[PDB]
Structure formats: C-alpha cells, structure tokens
DNA sequence: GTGTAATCAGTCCGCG
DNA sequence: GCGGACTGGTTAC
C-alpha cells in the first residue's frame, strides 16, 4: 500500500514522524531534515524556481532547520524577502508524500477517553490536579475495546468492584442499562491504589499510543488533569510519557479576555469533540454538556443519578463507573452520526497538514496552495505584517414588511468561490486597475466597459485571462468535492420523502428494510417494494436515509465552509495571501451581481405580465432573490388548480423553464460586460412557497432584513410529503430564546402561514392562559456570559451591567458560603429568569449554568418568584407583535358589530 | 481557529 | 416612552 503519515513534529533539528509503512504497520522515525528556502536572484542566473509573479529565485539548502530559521531573521535584519515554506514540517510532508494521499482509517489509532475525579471542594482544577483520578475509560478504535481503569481505594472512600452483570441490566432491574452492543467490548481493570492505576495507564498508552485523541472537553479538562496529576505524583519525566516523543508544551491560549492552560502533546493530534462539534455542526446550542448534546443528537435520555457527582462514587460506585463508560460511548455514537473525525482526516490529508490544523482554514489553505505551487517549481512569498482594516461586504435589500402569498427564491451556487473562479481572482493574476464608476452605473449597464483585455470586478480590479490563478485552481477542486457530496445529501433527502409518503399506508406484514444505497435516487423497483413494506421496516429505512443525509450534510457543508473561508481569508491579515484588493473584488462583484440580476428579473417578469415598473423581486441577501409569484398564479387563476401540488408543479416548471433561462441570459451579459474569464453565475431556484390551496394561510411574511418566514413545498428539488417552514432570523431560530417559546412562536407562525388569522388567535389565547405551567428551564432565556468580573463591584452590578451578568451576580450572592453548588464559568452559557418585585434575591433577575437544574436550596425560591408576566411580554408577545404587525394580522380578535348579538 | 451585514436586548440619558 | 450611542450577543449570508 501507499505510505501515509500519522503525525509530524519539529523537535529542534529533527522531524519526528509517526507513519503507516507500505505494509500497513505503524512506525516512528527521526529525520535530520534539511529545509530549503529561497531568495530572489539576478535574471542572468539560470534557475528552475520562480516566485508567483515569475521572478527567478535561487534555492538555499540549509545544514539544519535552526540555520534556516536564523537565515529568515537575518534577511529581516537586511530588509530582504525570505521566500518559501517557513513551517518546515509542512515542507517535510510535501517532500515525503509527493502524491495524493490515500489513507486507511482502520490503521489509524483513534482514542476516545474520559476521566472521573471525585472532588469534595468544588470543581477539580486541572492545573492543580489535587484530587485522585478514580476512573478512566479509554476506547481504542483498532482493538474496538473500552478499557476501564477503576480505582477501588481512595482517600474519598473504598468501594467494591463494578459489576458488568448489573451494568447490563435495565434501570428497572436496578441496573445501569449499559448498551448490550458494547457489553462484550469492555475490558475492566480494578486497582487498589492510584499510583498503580496511573502506571498501568501509561504502560497501556505506550502500547496503544493514540494518533487521534478525542473525547468531550479532553483538551481543557481530561488531558491537563491527567498530565498534571501524573506530574504531581511521579514528576515531569513520567508525565511526558503521554507524548510518544516525550515532549510537551504547557501552552496558554490567548483570546478576547483572560487565558487558560492547555498541554501540547508532541506526536499526538488532539481533536476535542466539543471543538469538532462547534466548528462542524452548524448548530448553536444553549448548553454543551454531553448530556445535552447527546439528547439532541441521539434522542437518548439524560444519565440519571441521585445527589451531587461529588458523592456519586461513594454512594453508588456501580453507576459511577457505568456512566463513565456510557459517556465515552455517547461520543462514539455522535461521531457515528456526524462523522466529524472522518471529515478531519479527509481534509487534513488532502491539505497535507497536521490533522489538528483542520481547525484553521488559514493553515489549511496555506498548505494546499503551497503544495500546488511547489508542483510547478514555484516559490511562495514570505508572510508580511498588515494593519487590520475594515472593508465592504454584501448587499442586503430592504424589504417592505408585509405578508407575501406566493414566493419563489433563487440564489447562486457557491457564490463567493464562483466569483473567484469567474473573475480569476488570485494573488498572481492581478493585471492592474481601471477607473471606477459608481456601483449603480454598472448595475444599470451605463458605465463604460472596464476593460477589453482583462477580467474585471466593479471595485476597479483587473485580472489576467490567459491562465487560471492558483486560488481559482485550488478552490475549484474543493468545490467539485463539495458538489459531489451535496448530490448524495439531496438524494438521501428525496429518498427520505418517498419513505414518509409510503408511511401513510404501511402494510400489515412482517418483513425487512431493503438493502439500498440512500445516496442515490430510488429506482422504480425500489419504490414498488417500499409501497409494500411494514411500518417497522419503513421507519428503519427512514432512519437510515436520514443518517445518510446527515453524513452527506457533514461532508458538503464543511467543504462549502472551507471554500467560503478562502474568500474570507483574503481579508485576514494573518493569511499569506492577504490582499484587501482581492477580498473587496469579491464582495463588490457580489453586490453588483445581486442588483444586476434583480433588475433583469424585474424586467423579464414585467415583460411576460405586460406591466411596467412593477417590483417582482421583494428581497435579496448577498446572492439571493425572492420573487413574488402572485401574478403568475393569478394569470392562470387559482380555480384551475386541482390541489396544492398542482400549483407547486406549475411554479416549479415556470422557474426551471422560463425564469432560470432568463436569469442565465442576464448573467452571461454581465460576464461579457466585466470581460470575465468564465461564466459561472448559476442562480438556481431554492424554494417554492405559498399557503395550502383553498386555505386562509398567508404563505409568508418579512418583518425586515434577515427576518422572514415561508411555507415551503419544494426546496432545491425536494418535494416534501408535508410543507416545511423556512424561518430565518426570527426568535424561533435563536439559541437565546426559551425552548418552549421557540416552540410556541413556531406554531404561531405555522398557523399564520398555513391556516390564517383565526387559527393564530385561537392558539395565542390558549398559550397565554396555560404557559405558567411550563417547566422553568423551558421558559428561561439563554446567554453566553463574558466579563463577569468586569461588572462585579463588591458582589453587585457595576455601571452598564448587562442583564444576564446582573442575573449571575444575583446567583453568586444567593449561593455564597457553598464550596458545593455549581459556579458559573466565565465564557460559558447561562439560563436567565426575571424575578418579581420584592423577591428575596434582591434583584430583578437570576442566572445559573445552562443545561442544568438550579441548585436545590434556591430552586424553590426561584420558582416562587419567577416573573411570568415579564417573561411572556419579553420573549413571546414582543416578537409575536412584530410578526403579526408585519403580516397585517391580529393575534387577538378585535371588536366587531356582530358582538351586539 | 475565514469574512461583513444585520436585527435585537439592554443600559444610560436626553427630550422642554 | 422612544431614540440614539453604546455594549453585548447571535444570526444570515
Ligand atoms: N461562514 C461564512 N464565511 C464566509 N463567507 C460566507 C459564510 N457564509 C456565507 N458566506 C458568503 O455568502 C455567500 C452566499 O452564502 P450561501 O449561504 O448562499 O452559500 P454559497 O457559498 O452560495 O453556497 P450554496 O451553494 O449552498 O448556496 C457565500 O458564497 C460566501
Ligand atoms: Ca463524568
Ligand atoms: Ca448561495
Ligand atoms: Ca442552490
Ligand atoms: Ca403500503
Ligand atoms: Ca443564499
């Protein structure tokens, strides 16, 4: 097989590499790698190396990496550019793996672990590690085993061995319900002292040294705790055995405010699952506890135990260990679904970077571009310092707030990457500038044509047309990958809808789900078999279809994010290819494209309707247009349609056969006007929206920019069994909005769009009467809590104290004296409730850690003093008033003459 | 740990 | 009470 790296490090003048050899074996080596860098040289000097602008370079080969680094500094002292890849491990990988890497995930040791630490005096700080580690569960992907290290004897209690038999039993048998599918995969090791536990853990680690190390909060808790605890008991040298090269760095993270300590383990790639989830999931959660995320992702119930975790080991060691094992498994289940580890390996190996560098699109693109250029013997420019400067972005149309009955939307496929490709925007393709007219003049095609030679953006930039830039070249490759995966995702989605339809008529039989590939549209034969299946089999198939869709989603959306990040990186001063001319070329072209096509669509529809000056485009954001279809429907007449699906077909056909060709003609003209390299503006229909046929539903409404709701029947070619709400920006979509309030507001919107004013009024009246019964967590607001200390003046709110910070200070006073009772953590999220006048907490609100029940000793008082009236007005009525006034609807029935009877 | 545009909640305080 | 200046936080692209 072809070799591939596992990890790479620079340690002094040595590259330390773990890799899989041609026989599939893991090996380690130390290489005295001699790096090359580059200097510009005279024209008269024969060379094969050129910088990206075509200027010749001489290669300088250094005796070692430190000599190369020292040369960089002296070049700075002289005032000359030192060219080439200054991150020598990336150069090493480029030399050692000079081919497209094919990796075998089954040979990569992926370790998933979690530790337990009993602490009678608050949260166990990893920097101090003053308490015994009393459990470790470590899952190894190569063995497919859960290794459980269990401390039976501690200063905080001596306990009995954990029983696998009890662990397997149902909760109703007194068991822990450890899933049957992992029972046979547990290797359980009890220890009568912590020293032997840790020594054996380290011997185990040596035997089965993780390549990828993951788990939940492992980077911020488990890794530093384990490292520091071993360090405290045995000394530094023993702790460094966590690194296969015995090198670690105690590395401090610097961001917005304050700092925290992480341990870099050389020769390991740590991908904390919480960080993977935050970067790759495109959710924003009210809480990031594993309980919370597991329930959301997998629909598993919260791990239930009595009393605080600080007393769980002594009171119920059996459950204590079972829950540690289950916690590790839940992360594996989340990954089975989301496939973020797979994604990281794919992207890491593609770029030829340390796998953990997938968190940095700048590092990722730096490596992609370096490897691409190196292939042609080209030499990358040196990174330079630049001042941070603001620059302009997208155009967003101001919508007239209103209901909108029938709506068809369209937007550009991969807008910014397509602009880069079309215009040929790249550091080395800059051809010069032209004299810019106001944007309006380009939009209306009255400005002088910018160039007859070069490809142009309305910001004044010109680009070469003879050859593709490296940025267009490399962005195209990842775009094509994105396109492939999105194809699979949409097929799985369409397949899902077929199953949902079939589920209206399940068969009374006993059978099996069909063995099919959900990434491809079901054949006619498959469709026929599905119509004969039982509900049980159909439901299993739907589950599998949806899992396939999720897998496609992960693969496609994060590839989209990477290519969009390249466009963004052009405007970040740390990017090697930072250039505000290029960043702005993209954004300004985008502004033109949207407004150009708005004009073209209006002109087209006025023509086919025989009107003049009528605005069919009601809204747009960045690269999208929303077109009112009322006049199109009315030209045929609502009475001519058999059912909702009939007019949906009609608009679908109209968009595909009339609008899109008109849109395409409009964009080809714009391409020619800007003299672009290649027409790549592809604005396909997104949504077909409207009320159910014959209903009093309003179909859709906008309250303002980035705030709207649509009742959608078909989304990018997916025809839904049931209409789906596309809601953007409204409170139903915000993690800050209470969960029950999101739900209630969404039902109000559903009723508005699908059923009408009377239905909305009926629901509002019920919610208002019943809502005080809702669980307090479900009606609590959510906020991130930064700078708690800044606003804390002797335990009370300082000037300009934010509402949620005020709540935290209230909480702090209320729990004063406890070494127990959860502390609010700087930077994490809190639930927030308003408090009625004259409450015993002495302020107007209280806040506590999100994803948790508020501590027992104040829970009762919070419940008693919760201000339901303020909560309702602020989170529910105020937003609903905004929705209904925009839609010209009343949420409460107004008086009428009929009341006289 | 790529980017800008945008609405909103809340504080403070003016507005005769 | 609403709005502007401001901070804080979050979402649409
Ligand atoms: N997370 C982001 N970072 C930087 N730029 C972004 C981001 N999201 C959107 N954009 C910019 O807005 C443009 C339009 O966004 P949109 O969500 O329509 O994605 P897209 O790239 O057009 O892909 P799609 O083909 O899914 O529409 C993007 O091309 C770019
Ligand atoms: Ca735990
Ligand atoms: Ca788009
Ligand atoms: Ca599309
Ligand atoms: Ca059937
Ligand atoms: Ca869009």
XYZ file of N, CA, C and O in Angstrom, chain A residues 492-651:
640
model
N -30.442 11.549 -0.658
C -30.887 10.912 0.597
C -32.120 11.605 1.177
O -33.020 10.969 1.742
N -32.153 12.918 1.016
C -33.289 13.729 1.399
C -34.533 13.387 0.575
O -35.611 13.182 1.135
N -34.385 13.313 -0.749
C -35.508 12.961 -1.620
C -35.987 11.534 -1.329
O -37.191 11.269 -1.315
N -35.042 10.634 -1.079
C -35.364 9.253 -0.727
C -36.170 9.193 0.575
O -37.134 8.428 0.686
N -35.762 10.012 1.548
C -36.487 10.163 2.809
C -37.949 10.544 2.615
O -38.830 9.996 3.287
N -38.214 11.482 1.703
C -39.589 11.903 1.417
C -40.438 10.792 0.781
O -41.633 10.692 1.055
N -39.814 9.952 -0.043
C -40.505 8.791 -0.609
C -41.005 7.869 0.514
O -42.162 7.439 0.512
N -40.129 7.600 1.476
C -40.456 6.776 2.642
C -41.573 7.375 3.511
O -42.498 6.658 3.931
N -41.498 8.679 3.763
C -42.538 9.391 4.511
C -43.913 9.263 3.840
O -44.919 9.051 4.525
N -43.949 9.373 2.511
C -45.193 9.190 1.742
C -45.741 7.778 1.932
O -46.920 7.603 2.241
N -44.865 6.788 1.765
C -45.205 5.374 1.925
C -45.749 5.073 3.321
O -46.671 4.271 3.475
N -45.189 5.735 4.332
C -45.646 5.595 5.713
C -47.111 5.994 5.966
O -47.633 5.713 7.039
N -47.763 6.644 5.001
C -49.201 6.937 5.128
C -50.021 5.660 4.981
O -51.143 5.577 5.477
N -49.449 4.673 4.295
C -50.111 3.388 4.049
C -49.222 2.173 4.333
O -48.910 1.410 3.412
N -48.827 1.970 5.609
C -47.987 0.816 5.943
C -48.746 -0.501 5.792
O -49.956 -0.539 6.005
N -48.037 -1.565 5.423
C -48.660 -2.873 5.237
C -48.612 -3.725 6.489
O -47.645 -3.677 7.247
N -49.663 -4.513 6.696
C -49.738 -5.397 7.849
C -49.006 -6.698 7.545
O -49.618 -7.738 7.287
N -47.678 -6.613 7.561
C -46.813 -7.757 7.306
C -45.576 -7.705 8.195
O -45.334 -6.710 8.882
N -44.815 -8.793 8.203
C -43.527 -8.823 8.884
C -42.459 -9.031 7.818
O -42.485 -10.017 7.075
N -41.537 -8.075 7.743
C -40.546 -8.025 6.678
C -39.292 -7.275 7.125
O -39.148 -6.911 8.299
N -38.391 -7.044 6.179
C -37.118 -6.394 6.471
C -36.959 -5.097 5.677
O -37.531 -4.967 4.596
N -36.196 -4.122 6.221
C -35.840 -2.952 5.415
C -34.991 -3.392 4.220
O -34.218 -4.348 4.333
N -35.161 -2.719 3.083
C -34.420 -3.031 1.859
C -32.948 -2.634 1.970
O -32.624 -1.601 2.550
N -32.067 -3.452 1.403
C -30.642 -3.147 1.375
C -30.358 -2.216 0.192
O -30.182 -2.672 -0.942
N -30.321 -0.913 0.457
C -30.157 0.078 -0.612
C -29.087 1.119 -0.286
O -28.717 1.299 0.878
N -28.593 1.792 -1.323
C -27.669 2.927 -1.158
C -28.483 4.227 -1.217
O -28.923 4.655 -2.285
N -28.691 4.837 -0.052
C -29.550 6.016 0.077
C -28.970 7.279 -0.581
O -29.675 8.283 -0.721
N -27.700 7.213 -0.988
C -27.026 8.330 -1.674
C -27.479 8.502 -3.123
O -27.102 9.479 -3.779
N -28.270 7.550 -3.622
C -28.759 7.581 -4.999
C -30.282 7.454 -5.019
O -30.850 6.667 -4.255
N -30.927 8.239 -5.884
C -32.389 8.242 -6.017
C -32.930 6.835 -6.237
O -32.422 6.091 -7.080
N -33.943 6.470 -5.455
C -34.534 5.138 -5.522
C -35.034 4.828 -6.925
O -35.710 5.651 -7.546
N -34.711 3.631 -7.410
C -35.207 3.163 -8.695
C -36.699 2.873 -8.581
O -37.246 2.849 -7.481
N -37.347 2.641 -9.717
C -38.760 2.270 -9.732
C -39.029 0.964 -8.982
O -40.038 0.845 -8.287
N -38.119 -0.002 -9.120
C -38.243 -1.295 -8.439
C -38.220 -1.122 -6.921
O -38.989 -1.762 -6.203
N -37.330 -0.254 -6.445
C -37.223 0.042 -5.019
C -38.489 0.728 -4.512
O -39.024 0.340 -3.471
N -38.972 1.721 -5.265
C -40.225 2.409 -4.945
C -41.393 1.428 -4.812
O -42.190 1.535 -3.884
N -41.486 0.468 -5.728
C -42.578 -0.509 -5.669
C -42.510 -1.397 -4.426
O -43.539 -1.660 -3.795
N -41.303 -1.845 -4.076
C -41.083 -2.666 -2.880
C -41.425 -1.904 -1.592
O -42.030 -2.452 -0.667
N -41.038 -0.633 -1.556
C -41.315 0.258 -0.433
C -42.819 0.387 -0.140
O -43.229 0.438 1.024
N -43.630 0.435 -1.193
C -45.086 0.571 -1.050
C -45.754 -0.680 -0.468
O -46.942 -0.657 -0.142
N -44.985 -1.756 -0.327
C -45.491 -2.998 0.246
C -44.933 -3.265 1.646
O -45.335 -4.222 2.305
N -44.026 -2.404 2.108
C -43.351 -2.615 3.394
C -44.201 -2.277 4.623
O -45.098 -1.430 4.561
N -43.891 -2.947 5.736
C -44.453 -2.630 7.052
C -43.946 -1.295 7.587
O -42.889 -0.809 7.166
N -44.693 -0.730 8.536
C -44.294 0.490 9.239
C -42.944 0.342 9.942
O -42.136 1.262 9.913
N -42.700 -0.813 10.564
C -41.414 -1.063 11.221
C -40.241 -0.959 10.244
O -39.264 -0.252 10.521
N -40.353 -1.641 9.103
C -39.304 -1.604 8.085
C -39.144 -0.205 7.476
O -38.012 0.258 7.284
N -40.265 0.456 7.180
C -40.250 1.819 6.636
C -39.563 2.794 7.580
O -38.759 3.626 7.144
N -39.883 2.690 8.869
C -39.253 3.536 9.878
C -37.751 3.305 9.987
O -36.983 4.254 10.113
N -37.333 2.046 9.925
C -35.905 1.742 9.913
C -35.229 2.321 8.667
O -34.145 2.908 8.760
N -35.879 2.183 7.511
C -35.360 2.775 6.273
C -35.266 4.301 6.347
O -34.283 4.896 5.872
N -36.275 4.930 6.952
C -36.271 6.378 7.114
C -35.111 6.800 7.998
O -34.432 7.781 7.703
N -34.892 6.054 9.082
C -33.758 6.314 9.963
C -32.451 6.239 9.179
O -31.606 7.119 9.290
N -32.298 5.195 8.372
C -31.085 5.025 7.568
C -30.913 6.092 6.482
O -29.795 6.580 6.256
N -32.014 6.473 5.835
C -31.993 7.577 4.862
C -31.503 8.882 5.500
O -30.668 9.605 4.926
N -32.026 9.167 6.688
C -31.712 10.395 7.421
C -30.273 10.400 7.924
O -29.617 11.445 7.910
N -29.778 9.238 8.344
C -28.356 9.086 8.665
C -27.458 9.346 7.450
O -26.439 10.034 7.563
N -27.850 8.818 6.291
C -27.133 9.074 5.033
C -27.148 10.573 4.677
O -26.118 11.140 4.297
N -28.305 11.212 4.835
C -28.417 12.661 4.621
C -27.493 13.471 5.541
O -26.803 14.384 5.079
N -27.466 13.123 6.828
C -26.554 13.744 7.792
C -25.086 13.599 7.359
O -24.335 14.585 7.368
N -24.699 12.389 6.959
C -23.333 12.119 6.506
C -22.978 13.009 5.310
O -21.910 13.632 5.294
N -23.890 13.087 4.335
C -23.736 13.981 3.176
C -23.669 15.456 3.561
O -22.844 16.220 3.015
N -24.534 15.853 4.498
C -24.534 17.211 5.056
C -23.168 17.587 5.640
O -22.589 18.620 5.268
N -22.656 16.756 6.545
C -21.327 16.992 7.130
C -20.271 17.190 6.048
O -19.507 18.169 6.080
N -20.223 16.257 5.102
C -19.214 16.299 4.038
C -19.326 17.551 3.157
O -18.311 18.195 2.853
N -20.552 17.912 2.780
C -20.774 19.028 1.862
C -20.669 20.400 2.525
O -19.983 21.292 1.990
N -21.307 20.577 3.686
C -21.391 21.907 4.306
C -20.020 22.384 4.807
O -19.729 23.582 4.825
N -19.170 21.442 5.199
C -17.862 21.824 5.701
C -16.846 22.064 4.598
O -15.898 22.827 4.783
N -17.074 21.438 3.449
C -16.333 21.759 2.235
C -16.755 23.127 1.683
O -15.902 23.919 1.267
N -18.060 23.405 1.706
C -18.572 24.761 1.447
C -17.918 25.787 2.392
O -17.495 26.871 1.957
N -17.824 25.440 3.679
C -17.261 26.350 4.677
C -15.782 26.619 4.395
O -15.321 27.751 4.544
N -15.055 25.580 3.983
C -13.640 25.727 3.633
C -13.419 26.664 2.440
O -12.535 27.552 2.490
N -14.198 26.481 1.372
C -14.042 27.340 0.190
C -14.507 28.773 0.450
O -13.872 29.719 -0.017
N -15.572 28.931 1.234
C -16.012 30.270 1.638
C -14.981 30.945 2.560
O -14.808 32.174 2.521
N -14.299 30.128 3.372
C -13.195 30.577 4.240
C -11.978 31.093 3.477
O -11.275 32.002 3.951
N -11.712 30.523 2.305
C -10.648 31.059 1.433
C -10.952 32.503 0.987
O -10.080 33.384 1.074
N -12.187 32.744 0.540
C -12.652 34.101 0.207
C -12.513 35.042 1.400
O -12.040 36.186 1.251
N -12.903 34.556 2.582
C -12.733 35.316 3.837
C -11.274 35.531 4.244
O -10.901 36.639 4.674
N -10.443 34.489 4.104
C -9.011 34.570 4.467
C -8.261 35.668 3.711
O -7.284 36.247 4.223
N -8.724 35.967 2.500
C -8.135 37.055 1.711
C -8.228 38.392 2.435
O -7.473 39.330 2.133
N -9.151 38.468 3.392
C -9.325 39.652 4.223
C -8.855 39.495 5.661
O -9.219 40.312 6.517
N -8.074 38.446 5.940
C -7.459 38.277 7.270
C -5.955 38.505 7.210
O -5.264 37.878 6.396
N -5.447 39.400 8.063
C -4.044 39.841 7.972
C -3.008 38.736 8.237
O -1.838 38.909 7.923
N -3.429 37.614 8.815
C -2.505 36.507 9.058
C -2.345 35.553 7.865
O -1.440 34.722 7.852
N -3.203 35.694 6.858
C -3.133 34.853 5.661
C -1.959 35.290 4.799
O -1.780 36.485 4.558
N -1.171 34.320 4.332
C -0.032 34.586 3.443
C -0.449 35.409 2.227
O 0.324 36.239 1.749
N -1.673 35.197 1.745
C -2.141 35.893 0.540
C -3.171 36.990 0.829
O -3.966 37.343 -0.035
N -3.140 37.527 2.049
C -3.976 38.670 2.412
C -3.839 39.771 1.371
O -2.729 40.165 1.022
N -4.968 40.269 0.879
C -4.960 41.402 -0.032
C -6.351 41.979 -0.061
O -7.275 41.333 -0.549
N -6.511 43.185 0.486
C -7.827 43.822 0.505
C -8.388 44.133 -0.887
O -9.603 44.212 -1.057
N -7.511 44.270 -1.882
C -7.950 44.452 -3.269
C -8.705 43.216 -3.764
O -9.729 43.328 -4.451
N -8.196 42.041 -3.415
C -8.850 40.798 -3.814
C -10.103 40.490 -2.975
O -11.135 40.071 -3.515
N -10.021 40.718 -1.663
C -11.179 40.497 -0.778
C -12.344 41.379 -1.229
O -13.474 40.912 -1.363
N -12.044 42.645 -1.509
C -13.059 43.605 -1.945
C -13.513 43.364 -3.390
O -14.670 43.635 -3.724
N -12.633 42.824 -4.233
C -13.040 42.475 -5.600
C -14.186 41.486 -5.569
O -15.130 41.600 -6.348
N -14.105 40.544 -4.633
C -15.116 39.507 -4.486
C -16.439 40.110 -4.006
O -17.474 39.931 -4.656
N -16.390 40.844 -2.889
C -17.603 41.386 -2.261
C -18.323 42.400 -3.136
O -19.557 42.413 -3.178
N -17.556 43.238 -3.839
C -18.129 44.288 -4.668
C -18.787 43.681 -5.912
O -19.869 44.109 -6.306
N -18.135 42.680 -6.515
C -18.712 41.933 -7.632
C -20.037 41.316 -7.199
O -21.026 41.361 -7.943
N -20.049 40.743 -6.000
C -21.275 40.134 -5.436
C -22.406 41.140 -5.315
O -23.554 40.826 -5.635
N -22.085 42.358 -4.866
C -23.097 43.420 -4.739
C -23.707 43.755 -6.094
O -24.923 43.919 -6.222
N -22.843 43.851 -7.097
C -23.267 44.098 -8.469
C -24.142 42.972 -8.999
O -25.206 43.225 -9.553
N -23.671 41.737 -8.839
C -24.359 40.564 -9.374
C -25.806 40.496 -8.882
O -26.726 40.264 -9.668
N -25.994 40.687 -7.578
C -27.332 40.651 -6.985
C -28.250 41.730 -7.584
O -29.363 41.446 -8.039
N -27.771 42.965 -7.592
C -28.586 44.085 -8.042
C -28.781 44.084 -9.562
O -29.860 44.422 -10.044
N -27.762 43.641 -10.304
C -27.890 43.404 -11.752
C -29.032 42.418 -12.018
O -29.914 42.686 -12.832
N -29.012 41.278 -11.332
C -29.991 40.240 -11.623
C -31.376 40.595 -11.104
O -32.371 40.189 -11.701
N -31.441 41.371 -10.024
C -32.730 41.899 -9.568
C -33.376 42.705 -10.694
O -34.551 42.505 -11.023
N -32.591 43.599 -11.289
C -33.044 44.403 -12.419
C -33.511 43.527 -13.574
O -34.585 43.757 -14.128
N -32.717 42.513 -13.917
C -33.039 41.631 -15.046
C -34.313 40.814 -14.815
O -35.112 40.635 -15.735
N -34.489 40.315 -13.595
C -35.676 39.530 -13.255
C -36.933 40.408 -13.296
O -37.956 39.998 -13.847
N -36.849 41.612 -12.735
C -37.948 42.581 -12.817
C -38.322 42.907 -14.252
O -39.500 42.897 -14.602
N -37.316 43.182 -15.084
C -37.556 43.479 -16.497
C -38.247 42.310 -17.188
O -39.201 42.512 -17.934
N -37.759 41.095 -16.932
C -38.314 39.890 -17.536
C -39.782 39.670 -17.154
O -40.624 39.404 -18.018
N -40.084 39.784 -15.863
C -41.434 39.491 -15.379
C -42.451 40.579 -15.728
O -43.620 40.276 -15.977
N -42.006 41.836 -15.762
C -42.842 42.921 -16.275
C -43.219 42.691 -17.731
O -44.333 43.016 -18.150
N -42.281 42.129 -18.490
C -42.487 41.813 -19.898
C -43.508 40.691 -20.083
O -44.459 40.847 -20.846
N -43.326 39.572 -19.384
C -44.253 38.440 -19.522
C -45.634 38.706 -18.905
O -46.598 38.006 -19.217
N -45.725 39.724 -18.050
C -47.001 40.117 -17.438
C -47.652 41.325 -18.109
O -48.812 41.640 -17.838
N -46.903 41.999 -18.973
C -47.387 43.198 -19.646
C -47.621 44.344 -18.681
O -48.583 45.100 -18.830
N -46.747 44.457 -17.680
C -46.777 45.576 -16.738
C -45.563 46.478 -16.936
O -44.758 46.261 -17.848
N -45.442 47.496 -16.087
C -44.331 48.434 -16.170
C -43.990 48.968 -14.781
O -44.875 49.399 -14.036
N -42.706 48.911 -14.434
C -42.212 49.421 -13.155
C -42.585 48.612 -11.925
O -42.278 49.022 -10.803
N -43.240 47.467 -12.129
C -43.626 46.572 -11.035
C -42.450 45.789 -10.437
O -41.672 45.167 -11.166
N -42.349 45.800 -9.110
C -41.247 45.142 -8.417
C -41.595 43.701 -8.045
O -42.291 43.454 -7.063
N -41.110 42.756 -8.841
C -41.330 41.331 -8.579
C -40.362 40.789 -7.533
O -40.722 39.923 -6.728
N -39.134 41.305 -7.541
C -38.151 40.925 -6.526
C -38.446 41.732 -5.265
O -38.357 42.955 -5.272
N -38.838 41.045 -4.195
C -39.269 41.718 -2.968
C -38.140 41.812 -1.954
O -38.238 42.559 -0.982
N -37.075 41.040 -2.175
C -35.991 40.907 -1.203
C -34.810 40.166 -1.811
O -34.957 39.432 -2.788
N -33.643 40.372 -1.208
C -32.421 39.678 -1.570
C -31.373 39.881 -0.492
O -31.362 40.910 0.195
N -30.491 38.898 -0.343
C -29.432 38.964 0.649
C -28.214 38.299 0.063
O -28.186 37.070 -0.094
N -27.219 39.128 -0.267
C -25.889 38.683 -0.709
C -25.871 38.102 -2.127
O -25.196 38.640 -3.006
N -26.600 37.006 -2.340
C -26.574 36.309 -3.615
C -27.933 35.681 -3.931
O -28.032 34.791 -4.775
N -28.974 36.145 -3.244
C -30.291 35.541 -3.383
C -31.331 36.577 -3.797
O -31.177 37.764 -3.506
N -32.373 36.132 -4.499
C -33.541 36.970 -4.753
C -34.813 36.203 -4.372
O -34.886 34.985 -4.554
N -35.784 36.935 -3.835
C -37.117 36.425 -3.528
C -38.145 37.098 -4.433
O -38.314 38.318 -4.412
N -38.818 36.283 -5.238
C -39.710 36.770 -6.285
C -41.154 36.485 -5.906
O -41.502 35.352 -5.565
N -41.980 37.524 -5.962
C -43.413 37.384 -5.724
C -44.032 36.702 -6.940
O -43.881 37.186 -8.064
N -44.712 35.578 -6.708
C -45.338 34.791 -7.774
C -46.862 34.962 -7.880
O -47.498 34.300 -8.693
N -47.438 35.853 -7.074
C -48.892 36.075 -7.059
C -49.477 36.283 -8.455
O -50.493 35.670 -8.811
N -48.839 37.150 -9.243
C -49.347 37.482 -10.571
C -49.250 36.314 -11.558
O -50.066 36.202 -12.481
N -48.276 35.435 -11.328
C -48.081 34.239 -12.148
C -49.198 33.239 -11.879
O -49.792 32.706 -12.816
N -49.471 33.001 -10.597
C -50.599 32.168 -10.160
C -51.934 32.747 -10.649
O -52.772 32.015 -11.184
N -52.123 34.055 -10.477
C -53.376 34.708 -10.843
C -53.634 34.741 -12.346
O -54.784 34.787 -12.773
N -52.572 34.719 -13.143
C -52.730 34.682 -14.593
C -53.366 33.385 -15.070
O -54.095 33.378 -16.053
N -53.096 32.291 -14.367
C -53.789 31.036 -14.651
C -55.111 30.975 -13.883
O -56.110 30.493 -14.411
N -55.111 31.509 -12.662
C -56.296 31.538 -11.799
C -56.316 30.361 -10.841
O -56.197 29.209 -11.269
N -56.474 30.647 -9.548
C -56.414 29.615 -8.502
C -57.392 28.462 -8.729
O -57.092 27.322 -8.378
N -58.535 28.770 -9.344
C -59.612 27.804 -9.598
C -59.221 26.688 -10.548
O -59.870 25.644 -10.573
N -58.173 26.913 -11.334
C -57.745 25.940 -12.334
C -56.877 24.829 -11.745
O -56.601 23.833 -12.419
N -56.455 24.993 -10.492
C -55.586 24.006 -9.846
C -56.352 22.933 -9.077
O -57.276 23.234 -8.335
N -55.936 21.683 -9.266
C -56.573 20.528 -8.634
C -56.295 20.449 -7.134
O -57.173 20.085 -6.358
N -55.062 20.780 -6.747
C -54.607 20.708 -5.360
C -53.318 21.525 -5.200
O -52.825 22.107 -6.170
N -52.768 21.556 -3.989
C -51.550 22.332 -3.719
C -50.390 21.872 -4.600
O -49.677 22.694 -5.181
N -50.205 20.559 -4.706
C -49.109 20.018 -5.503
C -49.170 20.457 -6.968
O -48.130 20.597 -7.613
N -50.383 20.684 -7.475
C -50.582 21.132 -8.859
C -49.953 22.512 -9.129
O -49.196 22.661 -10.097
N -50.242 23.512 -8.290
C -49.591 24.833 -8.496
C -48.098 24.835 -8.171
O -47.338 25.639 -8.728
N -47.680 23.940 -7.275
C -46.259 23.780 -6.960
C -45.512 23.282 -8.198
O -44.473 23.836 -8.561
N -46.051 22.253 -8.857
C -45.532 21.787 -10.157
C -45.438 22.900 -11.187
O -44.440 23.008 -11.906
N -46.494 23.708 -11.255
C -46.609 24.766 -12.241
C -45.516 25.814 -12.035
O -44.856 26.226 -12.992
N -45.322 26.225 -10.786
C -44.277 27.198 -10.448
C -42.884 26.603 -10.595
O -41.951 27.294 -11.021
